[PDB]
C-alpha cells in the first residue's frame, strides 16, 4: 500500500490481484535462426482486460566469466501502429528501459541477445522520425536476482506498473495517463544464439496471469513485510479464514 | 442533592501547543499559465494536466482568470485554504454554446 | 512515512525534514468519580488509574491541599485513613474501600483546615470469636453451651 | 475409595460502564450540539447500566453473607500452626487467618486458579494503570477506555472473598465446629458414610484408608487445571465472552452507516455546517442503535447470572455449611461433603463421594415372615443366608451381621411374598 | 416513557400540529417519518425492559411459593433455607405487590464454658456416640447435655447411638452400664 506501514496484523485489503488456483502461462519463445509465423498469433497474442501479473526468470549468461542478465521484453498496446501508443518494457543487463511511444512496429518482431548475437539483427521497429513519447525512463534492478515480478494494470485512463526483484511482493514503479484503453499485449521471442539444450542448457520463462479487483487477507510481521496472503473467495477454507480474519 | 457517587465529565484536558510542518521552498504549480493559454482544445479532445509537489493558492488563481462561475462538489471552498493534497488534476475544453 | 493500524488510524510518523520518528497517542480522556455526602460544600474526587503527578500537572491546576495516591488512583480532597475500617458504607468506591464523612465538631474542632472526607476500609461481615483452645484440653474439647435463651 | 471432583458456578461478571456522549460524539462540539436533540438517550443508557451494576453488588453481598453467617472461630486459631486435623491435610485450601498475618492472601488452589486467568478483578486495574504511556506501545483495553468503555472493580476485593472462604473452610475443623454439625470432621465423615449403608465396624477399621483417600483426592484436584479441565474452560469462557462483546462494541465506531466516512474529523474538515449535519446524523443514529442493542443484551444476561448466584447460595447453605437430606442435589448419590473456594467471577466446589471398587454377587430377601404371623423388613440393607442362617447386610458394603432390633423394622403382619422363617427369635 | 413525546429526534419540532400546518404534504412526510422512527424505537426499548423485569419477578415468585409450602404450611428438614438457622417457624402476610414473611428463631442469651467428649468406649470394646449433644463429665460421672442448652441428664438408649466398636479417640470409660 502507498506510503503506509502495517505491523503485526492481518489486513482486509481489496486490490488488483490474481485469482488463486488459476493458471499461469509461460509465453517466452526462443529460436536460434528461424522464426515461424505461428508465434505471432492469438494463441500468444493475449488480452489486456484489467491487467496482468507476471513472473520472470532472470537468466544469467556468462561471457569471459562475465555475468549478463537477460530476459524477454513485453509490449502492451491496442493496434501497434503509429497512430496509437504502445508501451515497451525491455531489459539491458541491469537497466530496464520503459518507453511509451507511437511506434512503427514490425510484422514479426523480435529482440536479440547482444552478448552472443544471432543470425538476424534485432528489429522490432523502424522509426526514422523519432516519434511522440508520453513516457521514457530507465530503472535499475538487481543483476544477481533470480526472479522478477510485475503488476501491469489500467484504471480510468491511467496505467500503473509495480515491480520487485528482492522478494515476492511488488512495489510501485510508475503511472502514466493515457486517455485510451489498452486491449492486447505480447511477449517477444528472443532470437539468441547459444542458450539452447545443445548449448549450456538455459531457458526463457515469462509466466503471465490476469488480474482483477478483489479482496485479500494480508499478514504483516514486525518488519512490515507481507508474509502471507489469502484470496477470500477461492475455496471454503479461505471463506472461513476471511470470516474469522485469521490464518489459523 | 443526596449522598452518592457520581460520574462526571469535568474539565480535564486542553490542547496547549501546536505542531505545524511543511516542506519549504517548493515551486509554484503555475495553474493559471496552463489555464490561460492560447491553444484551447475541443470537447472531443479535452486535455489534462497533473500538478503535484508544488504550491498554489486560490486567490491569485481566481483573480488572474476571468472568473465567470466557480462551484465545488463533495467539498467546500473554505476547506481548501490551508490544506495539502496528494495531487490535483485539471482538465479543460472550450464549450459549444448551445450544449 | 505513515504508520497505520488495521482499523485505519494513524499511530506514528517519520518526519520529512529531520528524519525523527514518533508515535502518536490520543490525549488522555476520562471522567471523575465524585463521592458526595449531603449538605457539604464539595465532593471528594477519584481519578481512576491515574498517578497524582499526572493529575496535578496535566489536568487540574486549581490548588488542592489534600491529595494522595491510592490503589484505585488519585484521591483529591480526602485523607488517607485505610488503617481504620467500617462495616457499613454508602459511598463505596470499589475493591474494599469506602469514603467516610466526619465533621470537626465543636467538641474537638481544629482552627486549621481539614478534609472531612476520609478514605477508609470497607468490611461488611465478621465472625464471632471465642477465647477457647483448638486442641484437646487433656482428652476433651472446650465448647460454649447456652444457659439461657 | 473416596472420589472427588470440582465444579465452577458463576456468580458475577465484569461491570461495564459506558460514557455515552464520549462514545457517540467524542470530542466535537458540532456532534454534541446535534446529539442534544435526541432528548435523554444517554441518560437512559447510563441508568440501565447503573441498575445492572447495582444488581451485581447486591448478589456479591448475598454470597458473602451466606459464607459468613453463623460461623464462630477460636481467637487462638493460627493457620501457620493449625492446618491439619485427623491425618487429613488442609494446607492448600486455607488462606491466612490470625491476628498476626495481614489479610491479603489466597490459598494455592486459588493461586493456581487466578494465574491462568489474566483479566480477573486485579488484571483490569493493572491493565488500566498502563494506559498513560501504553507500557509497550498499545493495547485493546486502552483503545476501549479512550472511547468511553470501562470495566469497574467490584465492591469487595478478591482477597476479601478469599478470607470468607477460608473462614468457612476452617469452621469445619476446629472445636466449635460450626459447619461440621457441631462434631469433628472425621466423625462427620463416618456418620455420612454410615448414612448410605456402610456399617460402623468397617469405618472404624478403615479410618486411615479414608484419610489417605481424602488426601489423594485433594492432590488429584490440585494437579488437574491443565488445558482440558472443564472448570477452567467454563471460567475462561466468561472472560472471553466479555472481551468479545466489548471489541464488537468498539468495532461499531468504524462503520459508515451510509455516510461518507466513519470519522468525525474527516467530515468536519471537508463539508460546510449545513451539509456536515446530514452526514453526522447518520453516524449518530447508527451508534445509538448499537448502544441500545448492547444494553438489551446486558439486561438479558444479568438474569442468568442471578439464577446462578441463587444456585450457589443454596449449595453453600446445604452442601458446605450443613448436609441436607436431599439426595441428588449436590453430587450424584453416594455424596459425602463439599468444600468451597474462591474463583474468578464465582465459586469452586469440591464434592467428595463414596465409590465402590470391587463387587460381589449375593442372593437377597426383602422381608421375613416370622411365626406369630409377624414380619420384619431390613432397614437400609437386605437379608441374606450364611451357613443356612438368616443375617443382615447393609446395601453399600457387603458385611454380614446378626439380625437385631437396630437392623429391622417390625410389623404385626407380613406380606404375601415375604420368605417364611420360623427359625427366628434371635438377637 | 412519557417524556419521549417531546423529543424532536432530529426533526424540526415534536408537534405534529406544528408540522402539518407549517409544511407541504410532500415535505411533512420527511419529518413525520423521523418522529415515527424515534417513538417506535422508544416503545421497543420499553417493551424489552419490561420483558426482562418479568423474569426476575417470576424467580422471586417461585421462591415465595417455596417458602409458603415449606416454612409456613409445613416445616422442611432443611437448614438455612428459611431464616438464618436456629429457625422455628414462619408466618405470612399480604403486602403491596408481594408477601411479608415473619420468621421466628431460637436465640441464646448467656453462655458457659464446658469440656466435652465426642463419644465413649465402653466395656466389651463397644462405642456410644451422643445423639445431638455432647458427653460432659459432672461429679466424675459422664452425663449427656444437649447442644443448644445446658442441662446434664443421664445416659440412656434414647440419648445415644450404639456401635459394636469404638473409634481410636473415643474416651475410655469402663464404669458405665446405665439404662
Ligand atoms: C537507458 O539506457 C540505455 C542503455 O544504457 C540507453 O541506450 C543507449 O543510448 C546511447 C545514447 O542514446 C547510445 O549511444 C547507446 O548505444 C544506447 N545503448 C543501448 C544498449 O541501446 C538509453 O539512452 C537510456 N535512456 C534513458 C532515457 O536514460
Ligand atoms: C500553451 O500550450 C502550448 C502547447 O499547446 C505550449 O507550447 C509548448 O511550450 C513548451 C515550452 O516552450 C515546449 O516545450 C512545447 O514543445 C510547446 N508545445 C508545442 C506543441 O509546441 C505553450 O508554452 C503554452 N503556453 C504557455 C504560456 O505556457
Ligand atoms: C498565491 O500564489 C502566487 C503565485 O502565483 C503568489 O504570488 C507570488 O508572490 C511572491 C511574493 O512577492 C512573488 O515573488 C511572486 O512573483 C508572485 N508570483 C506571481 C505569479 O505573481 C501569491 O503571493 C500567493 N498568495 C498569497 C496570499 O500568498
Ligand atoms: C533524512 O534521510 C534522507 C535519506 O535519503 C536524506 O535525504 C537525502 O539527502 C541528500 C542530501 O545530500 C540527497 O542527496 C539525497 O538524495 C536525499 N535522499 C532522498 C531519498 O531524497 C535527508 O537529508 C535526511 N535528513 C536529515 C535532516 O538528515
Ligand atoms: C507480533 O504480533 C503477535 C500477535 O499478537 C504478538 O503476539 C507479538 O507480541 C507481536 N510482536 C511484538 C514484538 O510485539
Ligand atoms: C573474451 O576474451 C577473448 C580473448 O581471449 C576476446 O577475443 C573476446 O573479445 C572477449 N570477450 C569480450 C566480450 O570482450
Ligand atoms: C545485420 O546487420 C548488419 C549491419 O548492417 C548487416 O551487415 C547484416 O547483413 C545483417 N544481417 C542480415 C541477416 O541481413
Ligand atoms: C541485490 O543486490 C545486492 C548488491 O547488488 C546483493 O547483495 C543482494 O544479494 C541482491 N539481492 C538479490 C535478491 O539478488
Ligand atoms: C545439456 O543437456 C543435454 C541433454 O541431454 C546433455 O546431454 C548435455 O550434457 C548438457 N550439457 C551441459 C553442458 O550441461
Ligand atoms: C446543613 O443543612 C442545614 C439545613 O438544611 C443548614 O442549616 C446547615 O448550615 C447545613 N450544614 C452546613 C455545614 O452547611
Ligand atoms: C505535565 O506537565 C508538566 C509541567 O507542565 C510537563 O513538563 C509534562 O511534560 C506534562 N506531561 C504530560 C504527559 O502532559
Ligand atoms: C496510606 O495510608 C496507609 C496506612 O493508613 C499507609 O500504609 C500507606 O503507605 C499510605 N499511602 C499513601 C500513598 O500515603
Ligand atoms: C465485626 O463485624 C461487626 C458487624 O457489625 C462490627 O460491628 C464489628 O466492629 C466488627 N469487628 C471487627 C474487629 O472488625
Ligand atoms: C482470654 O484470652 C486472654 C489472652 O489475650 C487471656 O488474658 C484471658 O485470661 C482469657 N479469658 C478467659 C475467660 O479465658
Ligand atoms: C433468662 O433471661 C431472662 C431475661 O434476660 C431472665 O429474666 C431469666 O431469669 C433468665 N433465666 C435464667 C435461668 O438465667
Ligand atoms: C487422635 O488423637 C491424637 C491425639 O490428640 C491425634 O494425634 C490423632 O491425630 C487423632 N486421630 C483421629 C483420627 O482423631
Ligand atoms: C504495567 O506496566 C508495568 C511497568 O510500569 C509492567 O511491569 C507491567 O507488566 C504492566 N502490566 C500490564 C498488565 O501490562
CSV table of C-alpha atoms in Angstrom, one decimal, chain C residues 3 5 7 9 11 23-31 48-50 54 71-72 92-97 122-135 141-143, chain D residues 17-19 46 61 64-65 68 71-77 82 122 125 128-129 132-134 137-138 145-146 150 152-157 160 164 167 174-177 251 254:
chain,number,residue,atom,x,y,z
C,3,UNK,CA,2.2,4.1,10.3
C,5,UNK,CA,-3.3,0.3,12.3
C,7,UNK,CA,-8.8,-0.1,11.7
C,9,UNK,CA,-6.0,5.3,12.1
C,11,UNK,CA,-0.4,5.9,15.1
C,23,UNK,CA,4.4,7.6,17.8
C,24,UNK,CA,1.1,9.4,18.4
C,25,UNK,CA,-1.2,8.6,21.3
C,26,UNK,CA,-4.6,10.2,22.0
C,27,UNK,CA,-4.8,12.8,24.7
C,28,UNK,CA,-6.0,11.5,28.0
C,29,UNK,CA,-9.7,11.1,28.2
C,30,UNK,CA,-11.8,10.1,31.2
C,31,UNK,CA,-14.3,11.0,33.8
C,48,UNK,CA,-9.3,6.2,38.4
C,49,UNK,CA,-5.9,4.6,37.4
C,50,UNK,CA,-4.0,7.9,37.3
C,54,UNK,CA,-0.3,13.5,36.1
C,71,UNK,CA,-4.7,1.6,44.7
C,72,UNK,CA,-7.7,2.9,42.8
C,92,UNK,CA,-18.4,2.6,48.1
C,93,UNK,CA,-15.5,3.0,45.7
C,94,UNK,CA,-14.5,-0.5,44.8
C,95,UNK,CA,-12.1,-3.2,45.9
C,96,UNK,CA,-12.9,-3.0,49.6
C,97,UNK,CA,-12.5,0.8,50.1
C,122,UNK,CA,-15.0,-1.5,54.0
C,123,UNK,CA,-15.6,-4.7,55.8
C,124,UNK,CA,-19.3,-5.7,56.0
C,125,UNK,CA,-19.0,-9.2,57.6
C,126,UNK,CA,-17.3,-10.8,60.5
C,127,UNK,CA,-17.0,-14.0,62.6
C,128,UNK,CA,-17.8,-14.1,66.3
C,129,UNK,CA,-14.7,-15.0,68.3
C,130,UNK,CA,-14.2,-17.1,71.4
C,131,UNK,CA,-11.2,-17.5,73.7
C,132,UNK,CA,-11.1,-21.3,73.9
C,133,UNK,CA,-8.4,-23.6,72.6
C,134,UNK,CA,-8.4,-25.5,69.3
C,135,UNK,CA,-6.7,-28.6,70.7
C,141,UNK,CA,-12.5,-30.1,73.9
C,142,UNK,CA,-13.6,-26.8,75.2
C,143,UNK,CA,-17.0,-25.6,73.9
D,17,UNK,CA,-19.8,1.3,32.4
D,18,UNK,CA,-20.2,3.4,29.2
D,19,UNK,CA,-19.8,7.2,28.7
D,46,UNK,CA,-26.4,5.2,31.9
D,61,UNK,CA,-23.1,-9.2,49.3
D,64,UNK,CA,-20.6,-13.2,51.3
D,65,UNK,CA,-23.4,-13.2,53.8
D,68,UNK,CA,-20.1,-15.8,56.8
D,71,UNK,CA,-19.6,-19.3,62.0
D,72,UNK,CA,-17.7,-19.0,65.3
D,73,UNK,CA,-14.0,-19.3,65.5
D,74,UNK,CA,-11.4,-19.5,68.2
D,75,UNK,CA,-9.3,-16.4,68.7
D,76,UNK,CA,-6.2,-18.6,69.1
D,77,UNK,CA,-6.6,-20.0,65.6
D,82,UNK,CA,-3.0,-25.3,62.7
D,122,UNK,CA,-6.9,-7.3,39.6
D,125,UNK,CA,-6.9,-2.5,37.4
D,128,UNK,CA,-5.8,0.3,33.1
D,129,UNK,CA,-2.8,1.6,35.1
D,132,UNK,CA,-1.0,6.7,30.2
D,133,UNK,CA,2.1,5.6,28.3
D,134,UNK,CA,1.0,2.3,26.7
D,137,UNK,CA,3.0,0.8,22.5
D,138,UNK,CA,-0.7,0.0,22.6
D,145,UNK,CA,-11.2,3.1,27.6
D,146,UNK,CA,-10.3,6.2,25.5
D,150,UNK,CA,-14.5,0.9,31.1
D,152,UNK,CA,-15.1,-1.1,37.1
D,153,UNK,CA,-13.9,-3.0,40.2
D,154,UNK,CA,-16.3,-5.0,42.4
D,155,UNK,CA,-17.1,-3.5,45.8
D,156,UNK,CA,-15.3,-6.3,47.7
D,157,UNK,CA,-11.7,-7.3,46.8
D,160,UNK,CA,-11.8,-10.4,51.0
D,164,UNK,CA,-14.6,-15.5,53.7
D,167,UNK,CA,-13.2,-18.9,57.5
D,174,UNK,CA,-11.8,-26.8,65.0
D,175,UNK,CA,-13.7,-27.2,68.2
D,176,UNK,CA,-16.8,-25.2,67.9
D,177,UNK,CA,-17.1,-27.0,64.6
D,251,UNK,CA,-15.9,-2.1,16.0
D,254,UNK,CA,-15.6,2.3,12.2
